[PDB]
Protein backbone atom coordinates (compact mmCIF):
# COMPACT_ATOMS: atom_id res chain seq x y z
CA UNK A 1 0.00 0.00 0.00
CA UNK A 2 1.43 3.28 1.38
CA UNK A 3 4.10 4.88 3.72
CA UNK A 4 1.56 7.61 3.79
CA UNK A 5 -1.61 5.56 4.20
CA UNK A 6 -4.86 6.50 6.40
CA UNK A 7 -4.28 3.28 8.97
CA UNK A 8 -2.06 1.02 10.81
CA UNK A 9 -1.75 -2.61 9.98
CA UNK A 10 -4.02 -4.38 12.56
CA UNK A 11 -3.13 -8.01 11.41
CA UNK A 12 -0.26 -9.38 12.21
CA UNK A 13 -0.08 -13.24 13.76
CA UNK A 14 -1.21 -11.73 17.57
CA UNK A 15 -2.21 -8.32 19.11
CA UNK A 16 0.22 -7.72 20.99
CA UNK A 17 0.75 -7.84 25.04
CA UNK A 18 -1.51 -5.29 27.22
CA UNK A 19 0.11 -5.72 30.58
CA UNK A 20 -1.59 -4.20 33.40
CA UNK A 21 -0.14 -3.25 36.86
CA UNK A 22 -3.03 -2.14 39.31
CA UNK A 23 -2.65 -0.73 42.81
CA UNK A 24 -5.13 -1.52 45.60
CA UNK A 25 -2.69 -0.91 48.67
CA UNK A 26 0.52 1.35 49.39
CA UNK A 27 3.20 0.27 51.92
CA UNK A 28 2.89 3.98 52.31
CA UNK A 29 1.87 5.36 55.38
CA UNK A 30 -2.09 7.01 55.20
CA UNK A 31 -1.65 7.04 51.56
CA UNK A 32 -5.73 5.85 51.67
CA UNK A 33 -6.32 2.29 50.41
CA UNK A 34 -8.05 1.75 46.42
CA UNK A 35 -10.70 0.06 46.61
CA UNK A 36 -12.34 -2.09 43.55
CA UNK A 37 -9.35 -0.74 41.51
CA UNK A 38 -9.89 -4.61 41.23
CA UNK A 39 -13.21 -3.73 39.18
CA UNK A 40 -11.80 -2.09 36.77
CA UNK A 41 -8.81 -3.72 36.44
CA UNK A 42 -10.81 -7.57 35.91
CA UNK A 43 -13.04 -5.12 33.87
CA UNK A 44 -10.44 -4.05 31.28
CA UNK A 45 -8.34 -7.39 31.30
CA UNK A 46 -11.91 -8.96 30.10
CA UNK A 47 -12.27 -6.89 27.49
CA UNK A 48 -8.59 -6.74 25.55
CA UNK A 49 -9.13 -10.89 26.00
CA UNK A 50 -11.81 -10.42 22.88
CA UNK A 51 -9.67 -7.40 21.20
CA UNK A 52 -7.06 -10.40 20.89
CA UNK A 53 -4.51 -9.22 23.87
CA UNK A 54 -2.53 -11.66 25.22
CA UNK A 55 -2.97 -9.43 28.79
CA UNK A 56 -1.04 -10.01 32.02
CA UNK A 57 -2.08 -8.42 35.37
CA UNK A 58 0.66 -7.32 37.64
CA UNK A 59 -1.01 -6.59 41.10
CA UNK A 60 0.77 -4.51 43.91
CA UNK A 61 4.31 -4.35 42.46
CA UNK A 62 7.17 -2.32 43.91
CA UNK A 63 8.18 0.26 41.98
CA UNK A 64 11.76 -1.08 40.85
CA UNK A 65 9.79 -4.34 39.97
CA UNK A 66 7.18 -3.14 37.08
CA UNK A 67 10.60 -1.07 35.87
CA UNK A 68 11.73 -4.99 35.28
CA UNK A 69 8.63 -6.00 33.58
CA UNK A 70 8.23 -3.25 31.79
CA UNK A 71 11.79 -2.97 30.43
CA UNK A 72 12.20 -7.37 30.22
CA UNK A 73 8.55 -6.47 27.86
CA UNK A 74 10.58 -4.10 25.88
CA UNK A 75 13.07 -6.20 24.88
CA UNK A 76 10.92 -8.87 23.23
CA UNK A 77 10.17 -9.45 19.29
CA UNK A 78 7.36 -7.61 18.70
CA UNK A 79 7.59 -8.81 15.02
CA UNK A 80 4.67 -10.59 15.08
CA UNK A 81 2.46 -8.17 16.93
CA UNK A 82 0.09 -5.46 16.21
CA UNK A 83 0.92 -2.88 18.67
CA UNK A 84 1.40 -2.48 22.79
CA UNK A 85 -0.74 -1.49 25.24
CA UNK A 86 0.16 -0.97 28.95
CA UNK A 87 -2.54 0.53 31.63
CA UNK A 88 -1.68 1.62 35.20
CA UNK A 89 -4.35 2.20 38.03
CA UNK A 90 -3.18 3.80 41.12
CA UNK A 91 -2.81 6.91 43.06
CA UNK A 92 -1.17 10.22 42.47
CA UNK A 93 -0.90 13.24 40.48
CA UNK A 94 -0.59 13.90 36.63
CA UNK A 95 3.56 13.73 36.99
CA UNK A 96 3.94 11.15 40.01
CA UNK A 97 2.75 7.70 39.74
CA UNK A 98 2.39 5.41 42.86
CA UNK A 99 3.91 1.55 43.32
CA UNK A 100 3.30 -0.54 46.41
CA UNK A 101 6.50 1.33 47.61
CA UNK A 102 6.91 4.27 46.28
CA UNK A 103 6.26 7.40 43.45
CA UNK A 104 7.67 7.17 39.96
CA UNK A 105 7.88 9.86 36.97
CA UNK A 106 5.22 8.28 34.23
CA UNK A 107 7.57 8.55 31.84
CA UNK A 108 9.44 5.53 32.61
CA UNK A 109 6.47 3.72 31.45
CA UNK A 110 7.28 4.91 27.82
CA UNK A 111 10.65 5.09 27.72
CA UNK A 112 12.38 1.72 26.83
CA UNK A 113 9.71 1.69 23.55
CA UNK A 114 11.36 4.04 21.82
CA UNK A 115 12.01 3.13 18.13
CA UNK A 116 16.17 3.27 19.10
CA UNK A 117 15.02 0.97 21.81
CA UNK A 118 12.31 -1.30 20.66
CA UNK A 119 13.28 -1.48 16.85
CA UNK A 120 10.49 -4.09 16.51
CA UNK A 121 7.48 -1.98 17.82
CA UNK A 122 9.07 0.56 14.88
CA UNK A 123 5.38 2.41 13.51
CA UNK A 124 3.38 0.19 15.61
CA UNK A 125 1.01 2.30 18.17
CA UNK A 126 2.19 2.48 21.62
CA UNK A 127 -0.68 3.15 23.70
CA UNK A 128 -0.59 3.92 27.14
CA UNK A 129 -4.16 3.98 29.56
CA UNK A 130 -3.36 5.47 33.13
CA UNK A 131 -5.54 6.38 36.12
CA UNK A 132 -4.47 7.80 38.93
CA UNK A 133 -7.34 9.02 40.87
CA UNK A 134 -6.39 12.73 42.82
CA UNK A 135 -8.88 15.83 41.66
CA UNK A 136 -9.31 19.37 43.26
CA UNK A 137 -9.17 22.11 41.15
CA UNK A 138 -6.72 23.94 43.33
CA UNK A 139 -3.23 24.93 42.68
CA UNK A 140 -3.46 28.46 44.97
CA UNK A 141 -2.16 29.24 48.36
CA UNK A 142 -2.07 32.94 49.35
CA UNK A 143 2.06 17.30 34.60
CA UNK A 144 4.02 14.35 32.76
CA UNK A 145 6.72 14.73 30.35
CA UNK A 146 5.05 13.90 26.50
CA UNK A 147 7.46 11.98 24.62
CA UNK A 148 7.77 13.38 20.66
CA UNK A 149 8.00 10.16 18.97
CA UNK A 150 5.63 8.82 16.24
CA UNK A 151 3.12 6.20 17.42
CA UNK A 152 2.77 6.81 20.93
CA UNK A 153 -0.62 7.51 22.86
CA UNK A 154 -1.51 8.09 25.80
CA UNK A 155 -4.87 8.64 28.16
CA UNK A 156 -4.55 9.80 31.17
CA UNK A 157 -7.38 10.37 33.84
CA UNK A 158 -7.23 11.70 37.56
CA UNK A 159 -11.06 12.27 37.58
CA UNK A 160 -12.18 11.06 40.91
CA UNK A 161 -15.92 9.75 40.29
CA UNK A 162 -16.88 5.92 40.52
CA UNK A 163 -19.49 3.91 41.01
CA UNK A 164 -20.10 2.36 43.97
CA UNK A 165 -22.36 -0.64 45.27
CA UNK A 166 -23.92 -0.52 48.81
CA UNK A 167 -20.96 1.63 50.50
CA UNK A 168 -17.85 0.49 49.36
CA UNK A 169 -16.88 1.72 46.08
CA UNK A 170 -15.98 -0.14 42.55
CA UNK A 171 -15.26 0.94 39.25
CA UNK A 172 -14.63 4.05 37.79
CA UNK A 173 -16.51 6.72 35.32
CA UNK A 174 -13.18 6.75 33.15
CA UNK A 175 -12.43 3.22 33.17
CA UNK A 176 -15.86 1.92 32.71
CA UNK A 177 -16.52 4.08 29.73
CA UNK A 178 -13.38 2.78 28.28
CA UNK A 179 -14.67 -0.75 28.25
CA UNK A 180 -17.81 -0.30 27.16
CA UNK A 181 -16.31 1.66 24.48
CA UNK A 182 -13.90 -0.45 22.88
CA UNK A 183 -16.46 -3.50 23.47
CA UNK A 184 -19.84 -2.11 22.07
CA UNK A 185 -17.53 -0.51 19.52
CA UNK A 186 -14.13 -1.01 18.78
CA UNK A 187 -14.44 -2.91 15.67
CA UNK A 188 -16.10 0.03 13.53
CA UNK A 189 -13.75 2.71 14.56
CA UNK A 190 -10.43 4.27 15.33
CA UNK A 191 -9.16 4.80 18.46
CA UNK A 192 -9.46 8.45 19.13
CA UNK A 193 -12.63 8.87 18.62
CA UNK A 194 -13.76 6.11 20.74
CA UNK A 195 -11.84 8.02 23.35
CA UNK A 196 -13.42 11.03 22.51
CA UNK A 197 -16.38 9.61 23.56
CA UNK A 198 -15.40 8.26 26.71
CA UNK A 199 -14.64 11.77 27.86
CA UNK A 200 -17.97 12.69 26.83
CA UNK A 201 -19.07 9.86 29.19
CA UNK A 202 -16.90 10.62 32.09
CA UNK A 203 -18.08 14.42 31.45
CA UNK A 204 -21.31 13.80 31.28
CA UNK A 205 -20.89 12.09 35.54
CA UNK A 206 -19.66 15.43 36.24
CA UNK A 207 -22.95 16.77 37.24
CA UNK A 208 -22.59 13.88 39.87
CA UNK A 209 -19.90 15.73 40.81
CA UNK A 210 -19.12 17.52 44.57
CA UNK A 211 -19.66 21.23 44.29
CA UNK A 212 -22.96 23.49 43.66
CA UNK A 213 -25.77 26.11 44.28
CA UNK A 214 -23.21 28.32 41.96
CA UNK A 215 -19.62 27.01 43.17
CA UNK A 216 -16.32 28.67 41.65
CA UNK A 217 -15.02 26.96 38.24
CA UNK A 218 -17.69 25.32 36.22
CA UNK A 219 -16.66 23.32 33.16
CA UNK A 220 -16.11 19.55 33.82
CA UNK A 221 -13.00 17.35 34.60
CA UNK A 222 -12.34 14.54 31.69
CA UNK A 223 -9.36 12.71 30.92
CA UNK A 224 -6.49 13.81 28.89
CA UNK A 225 -5.98 12.43 25.72
CA UNK A 226 -2.14 13.14 24.37
CA UNK A 227 -2.14 11.56 20.82
CA UNK A 228 1.13 11.02 18.42
CA UNK A 229 0.11 9.10 16.38
CA UNK A 230 0.23 9.14 12.45
CA UNK A 231 -2.27 7.32 10.97
CA UNK A 232 -6.26 6.14 12.31
CA UNK A 233 -6.23 3.50 14.73
CA UNK A 234 -9.21 0.36 14.24
CA UNK A 235 -8.76 -2.81 16.19
CA UNK B 1 -25.13 8.07 4.94
CA UNK B 2 -26.14 11.30 6.38
CA UNK B 3 -26.10 14.65 8.11
CA UNK B 4 -28.40 16.06 10.63
CA UNK B 5 -29.48 18.80 12.64
CA UNK B 6 -30.83 18.50 16.71
CA UNK B 7 -31.60 16.31 19.94
CA UNK B 8 -28.57 15.74 22.48
CA UNK B 9 -26.98 16.76 25.13
CA UNK B 10 -25.46 13.60 24.77
CA UNK B 11 -25.07 14.43 20.80
CA UNK B 12 -22.14 13.26 18.79
CA UNK B 13 -20.92 16.74 16.95
CA UNK B 14 -20.15 20.40 18.26
CA UNK B 15 -22.94 22.72 17.14
CA UNK B 16 -20.80 24.16 14.10
CA UNK B 17 -23.22 26.71 12.74
CA UNK B 18 -23.95 30.19 14.68
CA UNK B 19 -23.79 33.39 13.66
CA UNK B 20 -20.46 33.29 13.32
CA UNK B 21 -17.86 30.53 13.60
CA UNK B 22 -15.84 32.48 16.45
CA UNK B 23 -11.68 34.62 16.37
CA UNK B 24 -8.33 33.36 15.48
CA UNK B 25 -6.18 35.14 16.41
CA UNK B 26 -2.79 34.64 15.40
CA UNK B 27 0.47 35.38 17.60
CA UNK B 28 3.96 35.94 15.40
CA UNK B 29 7.15 36.31 16.38
CA UNK B 30 10.18 36.40 13.90
CA UNK B 31 12.61 39.20 15.94
CA UNK B 32 13.76 38.87 19.31
CA UNK B 33 14.53 41.90 21.89
CA UNK B 34 16.56 39.15 23.77
CA UNK B 35 20.63 38.73 22.96
CA UNK B 36 21.47 35.43 21.93
CA UNK B 37 17.79 34.48 20.18
CA UNK B 38 18.62 33.76 16.66
CA UNK B 39 15.96 35.44 14.45
CA UNK B 40 13.20 32.94 13.22
CA UNK B 41 13.00 33.37 10.07
CA UNK B 42 9.85 32.74 7.58
CA UNK B 43 7.20 32.83 10.39
CA UNK B 44 5.81 35.32 8.09
CA UNK B 45 5.00 32.44 5.95
CA UNK B 46 3.39 30.33 8.29
CA UNK B 47 1.45 32.80 9.88
CA UNK B 48 -0.02 34.43 6.35
CA UNK B 49 -0.95 30.85 5.09
CA UNK B 50 -2.37 30.25 8.64
CA UNK B 51 -4.95 33.52 8.20
CA UNK B 52 -5.52 32.60 4.23
CA UNK B 53 -7.47 29.31 5.29
CA UNK B 54 -8.90 30.41 8.76
CA UNK B 55 -10.27 33.10 6.76
CA UNK B 56 -12.13 30.42 4.52
CA UNK B 57 -12.74 28.67 7.36
CA UNK B 58 -14.61 31.26 8.37
CA UNK B 59 -13.10 32.78 11.26
CA UNK B 60 -12.53 36.99 11.80
CA UNK B 61 -8.69 36.15 11.76
CA UNK B 62 -6.80 38.78 13.38
CA UNK B 63 -2.78 38.77 13.05
CA UNK B 64 -0.28 40.32 15.96
CA UNK B 65 2.81 40.83 14.85
CA UNK B 66 6.51 40.53 17.52
CA UNK B 67 4.16 41.96 20.14
CA UNK B 68 5.63 42.19 24.21
CA UNK B 69 4.42 39.49 26.25
CA UNK B 70 2.26 42.10 29.02
CA UNK B 71 0.92 43.18 25.09
CA UNK B 72 -0.09 39.20 24.32
CA UNK B 73 -1.73 38.81 27.64
CA UNK B 74 -3.66 42.06 27.07
CA UNK B 75 -5.39 40.72 23.92
CA UNK B 76 -5.92 37.75 25.21
CA UNK B 77 -7.58 38.82 27.75
CA UNK B 78 -9.51 41.73 26.07
CA UNK B 79 -10.32 38.63 23.31
CA UNK B 80 -11.91 36.29 26.68
CA UNK B 81 -14.15 39.13 27.18
CA UNK B 82 -16.12 39.21 24.43
CA UNK B 83 -19.93 37.83 23.45
CA UNK B 84 -19.08 34.43 21.88
CA UNK B 85 -22.50 33.44 22.29
CA UNK B 86 -22.93 34.47 18.85
CA UNK B 87 -19.68 32.34 17.64
CA UNK B 88 -19.10 28.10 16.88
CA UNK B 89 -15.62 28.68 18.78
CA UNK B 90 -12.20 29.83 19.56
CA UNK B 91 -8.88 30.02 18.54
CA UNK B 92 -5.30 30.83 19.65
CA UNK B 93 -2.41 30.47 16.96
CA UNK B 94 1.41 30.97 18.36
CA UNK B 95 3.94 30.80 16.34
CA UNK B 96 7.26 31.85 18.25
CA UNK B 97 10.74 30.14 19.33
CA UNK B 98 11.10 28.17 22.99
CA UNK B 99 10.07 24.89 24.57
CA UNK B 100 7.57 22.58 25.21
CA UNK B 101 6.27 24.52 28.24
CA UNK B 102 8.36 27.92 27.66
CA UNK B 103 7.37 30.51 25.35
CA UNK B 104 8.67 33.63 23.90
CA UNK B 105 7.47 37.00 23.63
CA UNK B 106 9.26 39.92 21.82
CA UNK B 107 10.40 41.36 25.47
CA UNK B 108 10.50 37.68 27.63
CA UNK B 109 9.73 34.08 28.26
CA UNK B 110 5.86 32.90 29.39
CA UNK B 111 4.20 29.71 30.13
CA UNK B 112 1.87 28.39 27.96
CA UNK B 113 -0.92 27.90 29.96
CA UNK B 114 -1.28 31.65 30.53
CA UNK B 115 -2.62 31.30 26.71
CA UNK B 116 -6.01 29.34 28.02
CA UNK B 117 -6.27 30.64 31.46
CA UNK B 118 -8.49 33.11 31.08
CA UNK B 119 -10.72 31.00 28.56
CA UNK B 120 -12.27 28.24 31.10
CA UNK B 121 -15.93 28.30 31.89
CA UNK B 122 -16.26 29.81 34.71
CA UNK B 123 -14.08 32.90 33.36
CA UNK B 124 -15.99 32.56 29.63
CA UNK B 125 -19.30 31.16 30.13
CA UNK B 126 -19.91 32.26 26.73
CA UNK B 127 -17.63 29.94 24.76
CA UNK B 128 -18.62 27.16 27.94
CA UNK B 129 -19.53 24.26 25.75
CA UNK B 130 -17.87 25.28 22.44
CA UNK B 131 -14.18 24.22 21.28
CA UNK B 132 -11.49 25.95 22.55
CA UNK B 133 -8.38 25.53 20.08
CA UNK B 134 -4.60 26.61 20.29
CA UNK B 135 -1.87 25.92 18.16
CA UNK B 136 1.49 26.12 18.90
CA UNK B 137 4.51 26.08 17.43
CA UNK B 138 7.62 26.72 19.31
CA UNK B 139 10.50 25.41 16.89
CA UNK B 140 13.82 23.47 18.94
CA UNK B 141 14.52 19.94 18.58
CA UNK B 142 16.50 17.94 20.09
CA UNK B 143 16.21 14.29 22.14
CA UNK B 144 19.98 13.37 22.40
CA UNK B 145 22.60 10.27 21.97
CA UNK B 146 24.41 9.77 18.84
CA UNK B 147 27.36 11.62 19.14
CA UNK B 148 29.24 11.90 22.14
CA UNK B 149 30.88 15.35 22.24
CA UNK B 150 30.48 19.05 21.67
CA UNK B 151 28.08 18.93 24.97
CA UNK B 152 28.36 19.62 28.97
CA UNK B 153 25.97 16.99 30.74
CA UNK B 154 26.74 13.69 32.49
CA UNK B 155 24.45 12.73 35.41
CA UNK B 156 21.04 12.40 34.90
CA UNK B 157 17.95 14.71 35.12
CA UNK B 158 16.00 16.36 32.23
CA UNK B 159 12.34 17.01 33.93
CA UNK B 160 9.71 20.06 32.72
CA UNK B 161 10.03 18.39 29.57
CA UNK B 162 6.22 19.56 28.40
CA UNK B 163 3.57 22.29 29.49
CA UNK B 164 0.50 22.23 32.11
CA UNK B 165 -2.87 20.92 30.34
CA UNK B 166 -6.16 21.94 30.96
CA UNK B 167 -8.30 19.39 32.80
CA UNK B 168 -11.47 20.94 31.64
CA UNK B 169 -13.70 20.04 29.05
CA UNK B 170 -13.45 21.56 25.34
CA UNK B 171 -9.83 22.40 24.99
CA UNK B 172 -7.46 21.29 22.23
CA UNK B 173 -3.57 21.97 22.30
CA UNK B 174 -1.50 20.93 18.91
CA UNK B 175 2.04 21.78 19.90
CA UNK B 176 5.00 21.41 17.45
CA UNK B 177 8.39 22.07 18.43
CA UNK B 178 9.47 19.87 15.04
CA UNK B 179 12.09 22.60 13.77
CA UNK B 180 12.10 21.13 9.91
CA UNK B 181 11.23 23.52 7.76
CA UNK B 182 11.01 24.62 3.74
CA UNK B 183 13.28 26.59 2.65
CA UNK B 184 13.54 28.72 -0.45
CA UNK B 185 17.54 29.26 -1.23
CA UNK B 186 19.83 29.99 2.17
CA UNK B 187 16.75 31.78 3.51
CA UNK B 188 14.42 29.70 5.53
CA UNK B 189 9.99 29.90 5.01
CA UNK B 190 7.38 27.40 6.25
CA UNK B 191 7.46 24.74 8.38
CA UNK B 192 6.63 21.08 7.74
CA UNK B 193 4.30 21.33 10.10
CA UNK B 194 2.05 24.33 9.50
CA UNK B 195 2.00 23.49 5.96
CA UNK B 196 0.71 20.48 6.60
CA UNK B 197 -1.89 22.04 8.87
CA UNK B 198 -3.19 24.25 6.04
CA UNK B 199 -3.10 21.67 3.41
CA UNK B 200 -5.16 19.28 5.60
CA UNK B 201 -7.37 22.28 6.69
CA UNK B 202 -8.15 23.45 2.93
CA UNK B 203 -8.32 20.20 1.05
CA UNK B 204 -10.87 18.37 3.74
CA UNK B 205 -10.83 21.03 6.43
CA UNK B 206 -15.05 20.23 5.71
CA UNK B 207 -15.37 17.06 5.41
CA UNK B 208 -13.44 15.27 8.05
CA UNK B 209 -13.29 15.79 12.21
CA UNK B 210 -10.35 17.91 13.88
CA UNK B 211 -8.93 14.71 15.14
CA UNK B 212 -8.32 12.47 12.02
CA UNK B 213 -6.81 15.20 10.33
CA UNK B 214 -4.84 16.32 13.20
CA UNK B 215 -3.55 12.71 13.02
CA UNK B 216 -2.64 13.06 8.88
CA UNK B 217 -1.10 16.25 10.26
CA UNK B 218 1.72 14.48 12.13
CA UNK B 219 2.03 11.87 9.41
CA UNK B 220 2.74 14.50 7.25
CA UNK B 221 5.17 15.96 9.75
CA UNK B 222 6.94 12.31 10.74
CA UNK B 223 7.26 11.73 6.60
CA UNK B 224 9.77 14.77 6.12
CA UNK B 225 11.70 13.54 9.25
CA UNK B 226 14.13 11.44 7.37
CA UNK B 227 15.66 15.24 5.98
CA UNK B 228 16.72 14.91 9.39
CA UNK B 229 20.47 15.12 10.64
CA UNK B 230 21.56 11.78 11.27
CA UNK B 231 19.83 8.44 10.01
CA UNK B 232 21.88 8.37 7.29
CA UNK B 233 20.62 5.46 5.25
CA UNK B 234 17.71 3.01 4.86
CA UNK B 235 13.77 2.94 5.65
CA UNK B 236 13.83 3.43 8.81
CA UNK B 237 10.44 3.33 11.25
CA UNK B 238 8.88 6.62 12.21
CA UNK B 239 9.89 10.23 13.87
CA UNK B 240 9.27 13.08 16.11
CA UNK B 241 5.95 15.02 15.56
CA UNK B 242 3.40 17.28 16.47
CA UNK B 243 1.69 16.94 20.15
CA UNK B 244 -1.94 16.45 19.89
CA UNK B 245 -3.77 17.40 23.47
CA UNK B 246 -7.44 16.67 23.52
CA UNK B 247 -10.25 17.31 25.69
CA UNK B 248 -12.34 17.24 23.33
CA UNK B 249 -16.09 15.56 24.32
CA UNK B 250 -17.71 15.68 20.68
CA UNK B 251 -16.90 14.92 17.24
CA UNK B 252 -15.24 19.09 15.52
CA UNK B 253 -16.45 18.94 12.36
CA UNK B 254 -15.77 21.97 10.72
CA UNK B 255 -19.58 22.55 9.45
CA UNK B 256 -21.46 25.81 7.65
CA UNK B 257 -23.81 27.70 6.99
CA UNK B 258 -23.42 30.35 4.14
CA UNK B 259 -26.61 33.02 5.44
CA UNK B 260 -26.20 30.73 8.38
Redesign the interface.
Given at each position: VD??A?YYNMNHKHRGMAIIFNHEHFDIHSLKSRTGTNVDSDNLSKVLKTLGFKVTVFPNLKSEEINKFIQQTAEMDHSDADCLLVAVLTAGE?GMLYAKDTHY?P?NLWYYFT??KC?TL??KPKLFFIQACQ?DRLDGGI????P????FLIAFS?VPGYFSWRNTTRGSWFMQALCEELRYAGTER?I??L???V??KV??DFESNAPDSAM?????????????????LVF
Open positions: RNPLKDADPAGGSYRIVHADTDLTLTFCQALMHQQKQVPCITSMLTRL
